[PDB]
């Protein structure tokens, strides 16, 4: 046991000893992603490794919004990391200090969630409209083991009652889930955010940064790492890492890189740690403009080629083909972001979200789902402005579509064939804007940049156990896997927390840092949390109202209330407004 | 709602804003106890109050062991406080840093717990020997509401099966419980440490400081407070505080003090906060020596007189007479500490606890209970030495007796009438030392100092709701109550955490500090914790073994396993070794 999980304030504020033999250890980190930079920060702080021994290998040499970066308070590893990171906006404060102070003065909540029939709000908005069978299937999915859910789709565990409910409309749009996605990952998502079911439709439990994650999270970490002398090597293309797999131990021996076009090799010892971010969801992302579509592609990038080369060496390094291959053509591929300063587009937006987009505060509270759209278009507007040099009179909205190969409503073309204005054409169509001024507002009054990510749905692909390698593989001495494609316990991918948690576990295991890693929050194992979930799932109903029709549950409930009458259980039932 | 509870790493590392109008606010703190000094530290750190505006009023002008200061990892408020406090032993570290590092290199566990028949270990040691009815009564106490347990004794909720079990032997000695004590406080104790039931007999869950709490906790806080310029006024005897109770608000207007023998008054405004530690368990503590007993007394001290004077002003300031009056004469009154360097006394101690007392590490793992002693004597030896100038060849043991008016085994006198050597006489009697060298080893080879605390059992006295005032009373502007006699939610008195938690809540409510106060740990509301408790309570038995005799439970269990077969519940049952 090279690590142990923990919770509470004891292991939270505790600093570990400097681990043994660190001063003769180095670290090479492939990529400059969020998980890679988090691992370097943990090596500096918790591992007490000097910055000159840490190398960041970056492929690239020395307005687009990557939306969907929702955050919540129980990102235990993220706030453990973003504590010693000083901020760049205000002095004598951390990244968490600004995030705490900004989310307490302007709480995030959505006054409108789903609209349909070109602008009109959904009549059953706020309610989940989950039937008894839909709630049963939700419980059945959570009560099934993770081992029994290997290569199981969402449609294999849910019926047509679940998909017709408003709960699925919120769930499929908040997390960009698809019906052909992993049931293991969805089951992890239901258990992780079971305490946010009350704040699910109105987004009251969601927390947002002042800007995008690049300048709110990545840039503060870059400034922190550069202050400690962390070496950043650029123009480095990592082909493959030579691993010798013996029956007793596995050591990274050598890395083949392409340093500024010249292929050369770095030698490795047992002390020289290697951190690999296998796979990438932003790789091979073609871009478009307001007049031409983003060209579709399926070219495997550097991150996917490295994982394929590593997987051939050992079977327990994971299967990269289960994520980067055979992605359905109906999956989410194209996302667009539109920037405008035109008044009547903003006025239409204000008429739907009931808040001023130029006020500088929470605008939409999150995303807005177009239920009638054939593309399953969903758009969001964050606290404008999300950028530094962006003018104060301009707003930036982010648009993504779930289905890809279906013709749109106003434009009879798929999202893959529509240019930047044409995506903005149908977006204005569903906002209630008339079909006469719709054309010139997109082509001239707004600038929309499409982007085609062919791997933006890879983390939710159906997988088995062992398809994702362990964060530190078994019997591994200096090789670690970080990012959203590394296997850990009970955590949800496509979150900033998952990348940070994998970074923390990799550093703590390889360096044998004897400090408790903060476990995933115990909401699914909490009596109070599970009771609040039952109340919220069936549209704010007491136990008498939930079982008012079924006789088998009514008899069982009557015996239950008889045995708990005048007890602390009944007090728990009443204070959670279930009785 | 002037405060809110929270948990997790978000509110743990978050620093609050400087609260409004603080720079015109002052603070007067009565007493220099653990709770009082904790409140001053919170005012400096979280309240950002300058030290010159904080006053500590101390009655006193400018080897004894106060044993029983067990600590555990989930003292959430204590580690929140002892984080910014720098240590005095090692540099560039906090009090928590040393505590974390010392308790990970030398884990605390007891190789012997209960001895009887003059030295021999209990045959059923480690086991709880709780019957089915005893486990039923334990569950019934935890499942009853706190409101229904007003003025309820321990004997009123438990039967003779519970008191004959080894669980009660450990419980009545770890926490110095008595059969005539508050069932509310015991129910809080069972729910608080329900996750430590596995580590209850062997003390594997207990954590200890390097020295006594005065030098490990109080002195680091004193040095921290003096570095910030906190004013310490000495020779100040607080008689009463003038409170005007209107229908809308209550304000501390004036405090009557006796400054160095001269009675004078300090005026108060709404901004001038007042923190009162009502009651004291160490007050009116008479001392003895190796030849004379500690003289018994019942004189109300300054802390009890202040609470009585405050209680007359308003009914919701609590009832001090329910704790300081009518304490039974069989209750714990006399404690002794014995210091020796004689070899054969140490050798006898090593022969029982199986560890060297002079090694500098964990010696007894906690306390040792004498089951055959009429006094219910229990003695402990911590990591020697517990003091600074104490020689390396000397050990210091702490002896307390639960029953007080009963004659001892070797000495036919009560503990109240026995001198320092005579307490050491019967202690050596139960260690297996022969009845020939027993006398001169206590009178000449050891020095034992008795102490008579008449209020060392007041916090466990039977109480109703409102007997203890709220930490901040309702409609109170500048008056707060801190310490073990203030009422808070779900926390256990006679712990360092309770004094710190009351200090944190008082500072956060009076100053309107908008940061989450860490709640009491959610062990009673955790599915995993409750399942481990069931396994440990019935002496490591599976559900088939627990219900192997009762037919009503056997039928219900068979239906339960049928409904959970091949589910995540069954996985939870197996991984908690309950199935």
Residue numbers in the entry:
A (entry chain A), B (entry chain B): -1 to 60, 75 to 591
Paper quotes:
pmcOleate hydratase (OhyA) is a bacterial flavoenzyme that catalyzes water addition to C-C double bonds of unsaturated fatty acids to produce hydroxylated fatty acids (hFA). OhyA purifies as a soluble homodimer where each bilobed protomer contains three functional domains: a fatty acid lobe for binding substrate unsaturated fatty acid, a flavin adenine dinucleotide (FAD) lobe for binding cofactor FAD, and a carboxy terminus of unknown function. Each OhyA carboxy terminus is a helical region containing two amphipathic helices (helices α19 and α20) that arrange in a helix-turn-helix (HTH) motif that sits above a hydrophobic cavity from which a tunnel leads to the active site. In this study, we found the carboxy terminus is a membrane anchor that enables OhyA to solve the topological problem of accessing its insoluble substrate in the membrane bilayer.
OhyA was spotted on a grid for cryo-EM analysis to study the dynamics of the solution structure. The addition of 50 μM lauryl maltose neopentyl glycol (LMNG) detergent dispersed the particles, cured the orientation bias, and enabled structure determination of dimeric OhyA to 2.61 Å. We observed multiple states of the OhyA carboxy-terminus in the 2D classes from the dimer dataset. 3D variability analyses can be used to detect conformational variability in single particle micrographs so we performed 3D variability analysis to measure the dynamic behavior of the carboxy terminus in solution. 572,989 particles were refined for variability analysis to ascertain the distribution of their dynamic molecular motion. 278,661 particles clustered within a cluster with the best density for the carboxy terminus, consistent with the crystallographic conformation. The reconstruction from the variability analysis of this state yielded a 2.79 Å map. The states primarily differed by the overall density of the carboxy terminus, but no discrete sub-class of molecular structure was observed. This analysis confirms the carboxy terminus is a flexible domain that can adopt multiple conformations, but there is no preferred conformation in the trajectory of the carboxy terminus in motion under these conditions.
